[model samples]
Target: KVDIAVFCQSEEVREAVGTAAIDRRMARATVTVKAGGMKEATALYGGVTSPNLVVVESDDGEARLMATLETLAMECVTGTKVIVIGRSNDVGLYKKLLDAGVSDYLVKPLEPMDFVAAVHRCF
Candidate 1:
């Protein structure tokens, strides 16, 4: 079983992840969602322990996201995987995120199956 925490900036993304979290295939796992973005994640995680997987949706530009991710990394414990859902389907940014230790990068607007599958593989 896995524990997941999703921090999203928009209602649409929050709803999408919420629906995906309820899929039968994900029944073995527990998922929680909160309202926020990369910046919020960086701030809050600084004072809290991160879950097994941290899924965050950020509308910030690539530079800001990258910077925040670096800071967020300091707050997460070892073995915590991070998935970033962003507005841009940028190949360059995707590669950079992976290189920077992010487990996965999803482009929004998110498809239900796509998110579930990504979370599945992250396990």
Candidate 2:
């Protein structure tokens, strides 16, 4: 099994994922690029805890983001770190994710350097 997992929404982030993986020494990590969003992650982890680290992208608004996190909380084991890549750059939603135990939230279309930094911060 993998120690890290990333479920993203587009192929555009593949380069960033590769950069982060190399920079962070996560070459062996399972990077599911352009696979799906949070709903897919939730379904995949329904009866199983997520990996040591999970990076998931979501386009949900504040309320939906909260609902998504609540659903994820049941699947995320203690010590699991989560990084959220979201479309909206709302402060309130960021705060809610942090309060709910997310490690970090990066707004979508992130620069390669920013993506690497965010992943590094989680470690």
Candidate 3:
């Protein structure tokens, strides 16, 4: 089964995350780096619950971000680790996500090392 998946708007972001995941020896674990919205994400994942780790980007702010997370959270199975990718660096928003059960909050344009380090926190 896939352990880590990647979703972002930028190809560089996608490749960087994928490469890092593979370099970390998780390539065979099923990492998906794609560009799109939540609808596209749902389609990519099928109706099945996602794996243990998921990294997703959003241009939306706190409210929309929370809503999107709520939707994604509904599809999550047990032990799911969700790391939110947002444009803002609001610590309050980060705390809100954590309050709402988000595993971590990342501000983009994040670096490859940032991705790997975040995943390390989950692993």
Candidate 4:
């Protein structure tokens, strides 16, 4: 299976978040959540080789998000998709992310179905 890694601070919660997507057959791959205390280590591992898909929750603001995403892009292999889960909903920020090569930007406090739908629609 192609690996899809979710870097949520809460493993159980993030898995719950993606459950609907998995159940609905929206994503055909391994759905792995590097939750809570595992976040740093998981990200480290991801930074090594990349994945088929990467979903990251950014508690930090815009600047940090951009920097993190840049790092992610550099680490990931070509054509690897990177989706950002963030707090801001500014149109300008959204446009910037799109221009900067983000596969998708999900506004936080989201529902699983919506997230799944967004992912399906992204590519």
Identify the candidate with maximal lDDT: 1
lDDT of 1 by residue, 76-96 (tens): 988999999888988999899
- As a TM-score, model 2 comes out at 0.82
**Over the stretch 4-102, how does candidate 4's per-residue lDDT look in tens digits?**
777777444475566755674664767777753224534675648777888777767778777767766766788778777776778998898889998
In candidate 1, list every pair of residues with a backbone clash. none
lDDT of 2 by residue, 1-123 (tens): 246677886766666776666654555455555478788888888877678888887777788878887888788887878888888888987888899888899987877777667766877
Per-candidate TM-score against the hidden true structure: 0.94, 0.82, 0.83, 0.81
- Which prediction has the highest TM-score against the true structure? 1
Order of quality (TM-score): 1, 3, 2, 4
Q: Candidate 1 or 3, higher lDDT?
A: 1
Candidate 2 overall Cα lDDT vs. reference?
Answer: 0.76
- Local error of candidate 4 at 10, Å? 4.9
Q: Which stretches of candidate 2 lie above 4 Å from their native place?
A: 24-34
Candidate 1, run of 10 with poorest lDDT: 36-45
- Specify the poorest-scoring 10-residue window by lDDT in model 2: 25-34
Tell me the TM-score of model 1: 0.94
